């Protein structure tokens, strides 16, 4: 892996070091703290806060009750239609590895070595230049393969 970021402070907002062409991997290794209610990994168009930057792909594990992963897109400061995956691998106090693979038509995401979900593109992935990680999460490394 390339352009590896170690132990970033959260919230993390960083420029992705190359375009997200088909076959690109984003690999994120981390841990969920015991007090976590949710965290998110956002692939964004820029880093503006006011107005809020468009989020092509919001990947949002939530830990209340049996948990879930909520995926969505933010356009013009407005959330679209949620795609919720209830078969969630994440747990409070457990370590994880997320692999986001960018394909022509969709994102393909594996967690802890097992296929987890697909998310069809809503914003062209060529519009993505920024990776954001927010919420209650401990990140050990972020790595890229272009
Ligand atoms: O932070 C926001 C983000 O996670 C979006 C993703 O769609 O969800 C927002 O919360 C939703 C919530 O998921 C839904 O159940 C409720 O009816 O609407 C909320 C506001 O859009 C998060 O605020």
Ligand 1 atom 2 nearest Cα: 79
Q: 7-21 as b/e, with b when 16 or more CB fall inside 10 Å?
A: ebebeebeebeeebe
- Angstrom distance (rounded) from CA 111 to CA 14: 22
- Angstrom distance (rounded) from CA 48 to CA 113: 33
Cα of 61 vs centre of ligand 1, distance in Å, is 12
Token pair, residue 10, equals: 């959260």
Extents of the domains making up the chain:
1-146
| Resolution of the structure in the document, Å | 1.6
Token pair, residue 116, equals: 């987890």
Residue ranges of E strands in the chain: 2-6, 12-15, 25-31, 39-45, 54-62, 68-75, 78-79, 83-85, 95-102, 106-111, 114-120, 130-135, 138-145
The dotted CATH code for 1-146 is 2.60.120.200
Distance in angstroms between the alpha carbons of the first and the last residue of the chain: 9
Ligand 1 atom 18 nearest Cα: 79
Is 62 labelled as part of a ligand binding site?
Answer: yes
Cβ–ligand 1 contact at 73 (below 6 Å):
no
Cβ–ligand 1 contact at 116 (below 6 Å):
no
**Nearest C-alpha neighbor of 41 from the set 96, 80, 98, 81:** 98
3-state secondary structure of 38: strand
3-state secondary structure of 127: helix
Give 22's DSSP letter: T
Do you find a cis peptide bond into 122, omega within 30 degrees of 0? no
Computed from CA positions of residues 90, 39, 107, 77, in that sequence, does the dihedral angle turn out positive or negative? positive
CB atoms within 10 A of CB 70: 16
- Angstrom distance (rounded) from CA 38 to CA 45: 22
Cα of 76 vs centre of ligand 1, distance in Å, is 15
CA 96 to chain CA centroid, Å, is 13
Do you find a cis peptide bond into 57, omega within 30 degrees of 0? no
């Amino acid at each position: 892996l390339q352009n590896i970021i170690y132990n970033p402070v959260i919230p993390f907002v960083g420029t992705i070091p190359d375009q997200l062409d088909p076959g690109t991997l984003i690999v994120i290794r981390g841990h969920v703290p015991s007090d976590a209610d949710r965290f998110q990994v956002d692939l964004q168009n820029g880093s503006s806060v006011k107005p809020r930057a468009d989020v092509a792909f919001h990947f949002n594990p939530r830990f209340k009750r049996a948990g879930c992963i909520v995926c969505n897109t933010l356009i013009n400061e407005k959330w679209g239609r949620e795609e919720i995956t209830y078969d969630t691998p994440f747990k409070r106090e457990k370590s994880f590895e997320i692999v986001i693979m960018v394909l022509k038509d969709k994102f393909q995401v594996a967690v802890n070595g097992k296929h987890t979900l697909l998310y069809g593109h809503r914003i062209g992935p060529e519009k993505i230049d920024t990776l954001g990680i927010y919420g209650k999460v401990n990140i050990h490394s972020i790595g890229f393969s272009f």
